[PDB]
Design a protein around this ligand. Structure first.
Ligand SMILES: C[S@@](=O)c1ccc(-c2nc(-c3ccc(F)cc3)c(-c3ccncc3)[nH]2)cc1
Ligand SMILES: C[S@](=O)c1ccc(-c2nc(-c3ccc(F)cc3)c(-c3ccncc3)[nH]2)cc1
Lengths: 279, 274
């Protein structure tokens, strides 16, 4: 059973407005003149033409509840762009570090975010053939209208989410199914702390040296208080994921099985209250 | 062509397969994917014609992918079991939200209008497909509600109160008729044709140009946007199919209404249901 991705005439997008730069390109918001929905458009050589068409192919094949939904492709002599559902609430990074805009980010939502990132990345790994993210960062973990996760920019510059064996990449590191879990371990640490990993450190070059030595962000009372739900299980999960040996790192499936009970300790209502709190 | 193949799910990967209800084609059960770690819904009949009917529904769902259409996760196609796997909708259907008044004494206006906006967005996407895909069985019972009380339409392109009189015998003007009745029902929270004992009495009444009662009792004068909504309902359910609006027009009418509601009003209409 095959589903073709719709082709969207550029002239069908109205109210086109700049939002930001994406992974590679500009991200604009617009509205579909016929579908009557708000959309996001990622737009930018006939070499770079197959580049945009590759992301579109990946998003289309990687379709799932925690992966950014692609609506169609603009493929015209005058314009090339990917059209997706519009994500109103930015990225994880901005929820985590825009502390004036967001003074509180409730534990139910934080853990829900973590659970959804794992459910997302895991789906990529369970595809046939396995799809690898390799650039999982807080900046590309997008938040929908009700602050649910949509992962983007996978399978296509902050080194803090990079495993040390990828610093000088080989064929083995670029095919490594244990890169994403290191990134996830740094994100988990960052989410539970609301702190910038290696904040104290001056050079990103310096970070690379200590990270390659063995140093990870600090796991202590100051960064991760004792009042953190399931702290022991969490700290175990982080340290297990950012393990210097790729072979000593858990799969996303193993983490999920560990996270499933954690999330069940939060009353359904608390997730909804956490969201209302951000508004 | 950018093609995507619908995943094949092995029946052994669908754990805790516990019954939910029935559905148009067959039985609806809830389950969990072993590897993906998510709650899912499975649709299976409880024979070659039935097999071709099931795969056609799954082809429709996979081709009709949009924000307000039930998202299909994969096909479970084995000799032991044949089922359609989709996301799990934990909040029932629009029918239950409207008529389970004990469970839901208050269903706030922002949410009712959002629900109507999203049914129209879903049906409008179908009509905009190439070729246009007509629903022809739009009813409150197959308008599903997800985790955030957003609409997901199901049982499209495959009870008599949502059927236009001319259909009692494939026009693009059928769905708007159904939509007009659903709108009446969402705004009133009343069963269309309350007094009627036999579905034939409804069918007779409708064919004679009669419709669910628009009065102060069915539609209180304090309903937001009452004049506009009545006008959309009355045009939608016109005896003349040609006097009925397109879903585009129907959406152009609804857009100024939805702009009057801030996102928080939707969040607090949902928390009130909890
Ligand atoms: C009341 S009757 O008219 C009726 C019709 C359809 C359904 C009904 N059909 C489905 C359903 C499931 C999978 C499919 F592929 C197609 C439809 C669901 C469903 C989907 C996701 N999560 C929970 C339930 N509910 C239930 C009752
Ligand atoms: C600057 S950081 O690297 C960064 C990376 C990606 C994005 C970013 N990329 C996208 C985006 C859009 C379309 C695609 F096809 C792929 C990604 C979005 C997006 C999607 C839907 N609604 C709003 C925004 N945001 C924003 C910031």
């Amino acid at each position: 059973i095959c589903s073709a991705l719709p082709t969207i005439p550029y002239h069908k997008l109205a109210d086109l407005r700049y939002l930001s730069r994406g992974a590679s390109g500009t991200v604009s918001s617009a509205r579909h003149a016929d579908w009557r929905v708000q959309v996001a458009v990622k737009h930018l050589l006939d070499s770079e033409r197959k580049d945009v068409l590759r992301e579109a192919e990946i998003l289309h094949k990687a379709r799932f509840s925690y992966i950014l939904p692609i609506l169609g492709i603009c493929n015209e002599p005058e314009f090339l762009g990917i059209v997706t559902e519009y994500m109103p609430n930015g990225s994880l990074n901005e929820l985590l570090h825009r502390k004036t805009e967001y003074p509180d980010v409730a534990w139910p939502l934080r853990f829900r975010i973590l659970h959804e990132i794992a459910l997302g990345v895991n789906y990529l790994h369970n595809m046939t053939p396995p799809l690898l993210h390799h650039d999982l960062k807080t900046q590309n973990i997008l938040l929908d209208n009700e602050f649910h996760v949509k992962i983007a920019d996978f399978g296509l510059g902050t080194i803090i989410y990079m495993p040390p064996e990828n610093y000088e990449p080989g064929q083995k590191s670029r095919a490594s199914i244990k890169h994403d879990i290191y990134s996830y371990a740094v994100i988990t640490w960052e989410v539970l702390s609301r702190k910038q990993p290696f904040e104290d450190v001056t050079n990103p070059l310096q970070i690379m040296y200590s990270v390659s030595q063995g140093h990870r962000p600090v796991i202590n009372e100051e960064s991760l208080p004792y009042d953190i739900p399931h702290r022991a299980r969490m700290i175990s999960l982080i340290e297990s994921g950012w393990a210097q040996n790729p072979d000593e790192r858990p799969s996303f499936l193993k983490c999920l099985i560990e996270l499933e009970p954690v999330l069940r300790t939060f009353e359904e209502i608390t997730f909804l209250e956490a969201v209302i709190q951000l508004k």
